[PDB]
Amino acid sequence: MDIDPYKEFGATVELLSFLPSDFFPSVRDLLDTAAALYRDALESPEHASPHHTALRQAILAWGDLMTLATWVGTNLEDPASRDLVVSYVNTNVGLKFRQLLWFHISALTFGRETVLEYLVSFGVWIRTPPAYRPPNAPILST
Amino acid sequence: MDIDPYKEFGATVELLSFLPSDFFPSVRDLLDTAAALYRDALESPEHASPHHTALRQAILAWGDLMTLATWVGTNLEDPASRDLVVSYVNTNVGLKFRQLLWFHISALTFGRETVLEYLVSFGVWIRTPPAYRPPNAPILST
Amino acid sequence: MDIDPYKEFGATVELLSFLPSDFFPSVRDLLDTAAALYRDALESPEHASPHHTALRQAILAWGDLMTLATWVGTNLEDPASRDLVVSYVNTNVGLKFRQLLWFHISALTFGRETVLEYLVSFGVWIRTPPAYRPPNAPILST
Amino acid sequence: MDIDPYKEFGATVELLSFLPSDFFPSVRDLLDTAAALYRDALESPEHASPHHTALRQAILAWGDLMTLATWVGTNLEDPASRDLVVSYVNTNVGLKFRQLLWFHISALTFGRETVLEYLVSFGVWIRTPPAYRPPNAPILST
Amino acid sequence: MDIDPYKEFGATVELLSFLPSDFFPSVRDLLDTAAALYRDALESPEHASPHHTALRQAILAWGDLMTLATWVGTNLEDPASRDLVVSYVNTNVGLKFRQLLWFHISALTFGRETVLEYLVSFGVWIRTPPAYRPPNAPILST
Amino acid sequence: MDIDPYKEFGATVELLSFLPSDFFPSVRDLLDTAAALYRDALESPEHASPHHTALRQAILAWGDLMTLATWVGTNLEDPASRDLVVSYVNTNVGLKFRQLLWFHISALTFGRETVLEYLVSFGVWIRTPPAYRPPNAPILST
Numbered sequence: 001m002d003i004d005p006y007k008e009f010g011a012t013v014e015l016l017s018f019l020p021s022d023f024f025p026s027v028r029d030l031l032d033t034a035a036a037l038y039r040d041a042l043e044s045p046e047h048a049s050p051h052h053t054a055l056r057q058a059i060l061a062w063g064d065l066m067t068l069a070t071w072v073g074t075n076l077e078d079p080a081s082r083d084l085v086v087s088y089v090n091t092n093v094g095l096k097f098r099q100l101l102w103f104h105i106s107a108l109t110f111g112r113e114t115v116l117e118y119l120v121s122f123g124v125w126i127r128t129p130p131a132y133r134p135p136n137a138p139i140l141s142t
Numbered sequence: 143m144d145i146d147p148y149k150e151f152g153a154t155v156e157l158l159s160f161l162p163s164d165f166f167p168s169v170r171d172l173l174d175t176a177a178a179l180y181r182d183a184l185e186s187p188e189h190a191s192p193h194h195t196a197l198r199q200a201i202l203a204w205g206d207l208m209t210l211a212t213w214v215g216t217n218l219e220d221p222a223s224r225d226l227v228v229s230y231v232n233t234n235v236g237l238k239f240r241q242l243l244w245f246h247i248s249a250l251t252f253g254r255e256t257v258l259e260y261l262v263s264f265g266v267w268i269r270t271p272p273a274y275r276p277p278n279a280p281i282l283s284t
Numbered sequence: 285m286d287i288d289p290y291k292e293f294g295a296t297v298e299l300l301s302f303l304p305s306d307f308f309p310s311v312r313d314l315l316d317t318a319a320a321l322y323r324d325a326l327e328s329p330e331h332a333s334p335h336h337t338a339l340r341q342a343i344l345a346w347g348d349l350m351t352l353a354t355w356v357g358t359n360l361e362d363p364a365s366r367d368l369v370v371s372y373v374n375t376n377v378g379l380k381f382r383q384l385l386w387f388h389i390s391a392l393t394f395g396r397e398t399v400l401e402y403l404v405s406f407g408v409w410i411r412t413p414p415a416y417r418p419p420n421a422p423i424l425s426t
Numbered sequence: 427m428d429i430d431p432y433k434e435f436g437a438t439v440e441l442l443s444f445l446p447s448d449f450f451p452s453v454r455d456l457l458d459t460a461a462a463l464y465r466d467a468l469e470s471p472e473h474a475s476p477h478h479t480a481l482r483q484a485i486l487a488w489g490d491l492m493t494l495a496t497w498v499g500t501n502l503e504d505p506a507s508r509d510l511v512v513s514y515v516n517t518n519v520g521l522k523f524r525q526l527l528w529f530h531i532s533a534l535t536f537g538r539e540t541v542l543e544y545l546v547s548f549g550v551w552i553r554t555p556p557a558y559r560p561p562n563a564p565i566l567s568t
Numbered sequence: 569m570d571i572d573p574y575k576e577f578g579a580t581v582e583l584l585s586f587l588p589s590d591f592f593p594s595v596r597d598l599l600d601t602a603a604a605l606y607r608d609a610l611e612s613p614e615h616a617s618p619h620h621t622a623l624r625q626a627i628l629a630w631g632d633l634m635t636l637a638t639w640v641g642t643n644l645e646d647p648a649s650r651d652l653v654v655s656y657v658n659t660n661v662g663l664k665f666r667q668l669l670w671f672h673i674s675a676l677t678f679g680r681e682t683v684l685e686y687l688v689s690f691g692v693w694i695r696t697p698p699a700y701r702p703p704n705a706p707i708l709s710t
Numbered sequence: 711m712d713i714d715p716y717k718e719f720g721a722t723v724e725l726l727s728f729l730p731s732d733f734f735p736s737v738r739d740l741l742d743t744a745a746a747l748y749r750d751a752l753e754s755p756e757h758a759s760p761h762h763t764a765l766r767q768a769i770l771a772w773g774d775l776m777t778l779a780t781w782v783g784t785n786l787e788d789p790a791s792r793d794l795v796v797s798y799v800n801t802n803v804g805l806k807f808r809q810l811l812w813f814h815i816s817a818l819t820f821g822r823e824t825v826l827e828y829l830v831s832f833g834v835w836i837r838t839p840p841a842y843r844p845p846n847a848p849i850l851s852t
């Protein structure tokens with residue numbers, strides 16, 4: 001079928017195309033921001049909101065890809081293929097767990113509605129020419 | 143942090159260790175069972191229960207691994223490593239999306255509570271020795 | 285437009301994908317079951333339910349394809365192509381009048397709701413691995 | 427059995443023999459008229475009247491013949507036969523989907539009873555002499 | 569995206585395909601019909617109905633194309649191309665502002681519902697063959 | 711007559727003269743901001759507010775000019791006239807669909823009243839000398 005990760009949270013995968021792929025912080029930073037702030041809610045035995053349930057899967061699905069990384073680092077033959085496959089998991093494949101982990105850790109941190117009023121307020125920033133606009137891009141308010 | 147995929151649905155990842163890894167139907171069967179039966183509740187723009195939200199991510203996360211499969215099938219150098227990595231995904235990492243897709247497509251089809259009364263009623267089956275247990279293993283009732 | 289044959293009877297064409305293409309009985313058998321149990325309701329000058337109206341067209345549309353068969357059997361030049369076209373009408377083209385004639389002659393024979401209940405009951409059967417599913421697939425009850 | 431397409435709508439296939447085969451507008455025009463006036467009733471998931479259910483099948487059955495056309499245009503050997511078969515589906519075979527689409531499109535747009543009072547009113551204007559009837563054949567009123 | 573000019577006024581761009589392209593009066597006539605009759609509701613500083621708001625844009629958008637015409641008539645090099653581009657605007661692109669200006673100036677003069685009961689009552693006119701339909705085509709009543 | 715595109719939305723075409731012609735983002739960006747955010751409201755069969763009705767025409771009118779572009783790119787004789795006419799459609803002619811598409815996609819995105827409190831709050835910025843004013847121009851708040 002045609003599943004969007006975001007279709008029922010209030011944004012489409014095309015709406016997150018506003019955010020350039022450089023914008024999302026590194027995966028090692030979001031896992032810490034969620035492993036050093038949400039260790040009682042994520043590890044808790046009862047789901048809080050639809051974000052916590054979607055954010056377990058984002059971590060665990062990334063939890064298996066790293067297993068794929070450590071696995072491939074010790075089983076292939078061609079080291080170029082090893083670094084080629086290991087480097088491909090942290091380029092485009094790792095990116096889609098930067099959007100996902102961002103959109104949730106920024107959702108249940110700044111409100112499900114402040115993000116969606118951020119993407120619209122950030123897409124309007126980048127699309128503007130680099131002459132008739134402010135120096136800093138718009139920001140998240142609690 | 144320590145995230146279990148199932149901790150808030152009523153079962154732990156140790157509880158699903160009862161089910162032997164041969165038990166779970168193939169991923170191509172689970173995907174077709176949710177695309178030919180739940181093509182209205184998944185694509186829909188509003189989440190129904192915590193299973194539908196957890197089951198989008200299970201499909202899409204598997205949706206990216208197949209992209210990793212088709213990608214790796216056309217970019218590596220060592221074909222032996224290519225197959226190794228390709229088989230790997232469908233070997234083990236293709237397993238943890240057999241438990242996940244099973245536990246949900248069997249949750250919101252037979253009830254969130256009938257599964258958990260199945261694993262306990264199936265773990266008690268295998269536990270017994272070959273020449274001690276019953277013929278057919280216990281089953282799911284609607 | 286995007287017309288499904290089944291969209292308003294309670295099932296989608298993806299839902300009938302559960303049934304393997306070997307399952308549907310032969311067209312010469314369904315035309316006999318309909319013509320030996322649905323003559324007084326089909327030939328009749330007043331439609332009974334939405335199945336009888338959909339099942340006329342299924343027979344007549346198949347009534348023209350056989351005319352195409354008998355026509356092509358006496359007008360082409362290349363016998364190889366003659367058979368090719370003749371075998372193509374009884375392979376994939378004839379199949380879609382096996383699903384259609386099945387879903388109706390099993391609808392107004394066992395109830396419009398027992399099929400839908402059987403479709404899911406049968407779909408869950410095949411997807412199960414061959415070890416833990418019962419010997420016989422689930423069945424229709426009047 | 428002996429199925430008439432029209433037997434339960436209020437007219438027999440002999441009653442439509444009044445209409446000369448030149449009268450029916452082209453198939454590319456009725457498919458547009460039905461796809462430009464009935465796109466929320468046909469595609470809709472619930473049947474409105476016995477015409478909408480009979481008119482899906484008329485479109486889809488014609489939907490497969492065009493597939494036969496595009497298929498035969500790329501698989502036969504003798505081009506003379508390819509065109510012959512292609513022209514055979516747009517001469518006599520295509521005609522019977524001009525009566526059907528014409529009788530179903532004028533039944534839910536002018537009244538299921540105004541058509542049947544048209545065939546009888548139009549069938550008597552053709553039986554009389556050319557220099558006796560009105561310069562125009564009788565017409566449909568909403 | 570897929571925008572129809574008419575999708576929310578009660579008709580689709582396929583529904584206006586009934587009207588042959590010869591039917592629409594000339595643009596110089598439609599512009600004079602709205603400038604000598606609707607010179608109070610258009611220039612006015614408050615929109616009356618959704619037609620007046622859609623009909624400003626139709627005039628102004630045509631207001632810029634004429635500027636393109638007068639511009640191109642004094643800036644190109646190849647006179648053949650100059651005329652080609654000039655004629656082009658009044659050939660086809662001058663047509664799609666004949667449908668638009670017609671459908672509105674005939675909407676808010678004869679009612680939004682009498683037009684839509686005209687296109688259906690005019691498409692049924694042309695559909696019929698030359699020696700089968702009536703003398704004068706159906707007409708608009710206030 | 712004398713039609714302003716904006717006269718009934720709360721601003722005059724002279725009021726938008728504050729915005730320098732460099733300010734408006736490119737047409738390929740606004741069509742995306744409206745084709746990747748308003749695909750269910752614009753394509754919907756019922757108009758929401760006077761902006762949605764004015765914004766269909768802005769897209770479609772631009773939809774025909776691009777047809778003029780692709781047309782002129784394959785029919786003229788003098789390639790200088792081709793590039794001269796094609797380049798003139800994306801200079802001054804394309805500009806007036808940058809103001810229009812801006813004023814609407816910024817109207818029904820930030821409120822019909824926040825724009826009009828922006829132009830007045832932006833015209834006061836540029837008119838100020840480049841010495842007794844802030845570094846960044848004033849901005850839109852949701």
Ligand SMILES: NS(=O)(=O)c1ccc(CCNC(=O)c2ccc3c(c2)NC(=O)c2ccccc2S3)cc1
Binds near residue numbers: 739812816
């Ligand atoms: N903090 S912020 O909200 O991200 C923000 C940061 C910086 C600025 C500087 C000046 N603004 C603009 O030039 C501007 C305004 C409005 C618009 C615009 C550009 N074009 C669009 O195509 C667009 C795209 C998406 C949604 C709406 C729009 S319409 C404003 C806002």
Ligand SMILES: NS(=O)(=O)c1ccc(CCNC(=O)c2ccc3c(c2)NC(=O)c2ccccc2S3)cc1
Binds near residue numbers: 266271
């Ligand atoms: N249909 S059934 O319920 O699955 C079922 C199938 C087959 C048999 C045959 C003989 N039984 C046993 O040997 C047996 C009984 C009881 C137990 C057992 C083994 N050990 C466990 O570690 C265990 C694991 C989970 C839960 C409870 C237990 S305690 C009984 C029940």
Ligand SMILES: NS(=O)(=O)c1ccc(CCNC(=O)c2ccc3c(c2)NC(=O)c2ccccc2S3)cc1
Binds near residue numbers: 405423
């Ligand atoms: N009473 S009934 O409706 O006729 C009837 C219902 C159920 C059964 C078989 C039960 N056994 C299982 O091992 C089992 C359980 C659960 C599942 C499963 C197998 N795999 C799937 O891929 C699948 C496919 C579609 C929907 C859910 C699932 S998950 C037989 C009959």
Ligand SMILES: NS(=O)(=O)c1ccc(CCNC(=O)c2ccc3c(c2)NC(=O)c2ccccc2S3)cc1
Binds near residue numbers: 549550558560
């Ligand atoms: N506006 S209108 O009602 O459609 C209309 C009706 C009649 C006319 C012209 C004058 N009629 C006749 O010569 C006439 C009369 C009677 C008959 C006839 C022809 N032959 C038949 O074979 C026939 C066919 C069906 C049913 C009865 C009959 S018997 C013009 C218009």
Ligand SMILES: NS(=O)(=O)c1ccc(CCNC(=O)c2ccc3c(c2)NC(=O)c2ccccc2S3)cc1
Binds near residue numbers: 456696
């Ligand atoms: N004043 S009028 O209503 O416009 C009118 C003018 C002239 C005539 C003369 C003879 N009629 C027909 O041949 C005829 C009748 C019915 C139809 C038809 C053709 N085909 C269509 O595809 C079509 C298209 C749109 C809507 C319905 C239809 S079904 C009748 C009515």
Ligand SMILES: NS(=O)(=O)c1ccc(CCNC(=O)c2ccc3c(c2)NC(=O)c2ccccc2S3)cc1
Binds near residue numbers: 837
């Ligand atoms: N975010 S903002 O509102 O665009 C904005 C951006 C930057 C600044 C910096 C300092 N201001 C001024 O020098 C100033 C103030 C007020 C005025 C002014 C200049 N002259 C005008 O002729 C004018 C034009 C239109 C409307 C009112 C006025 S009176 C203020 C506001």
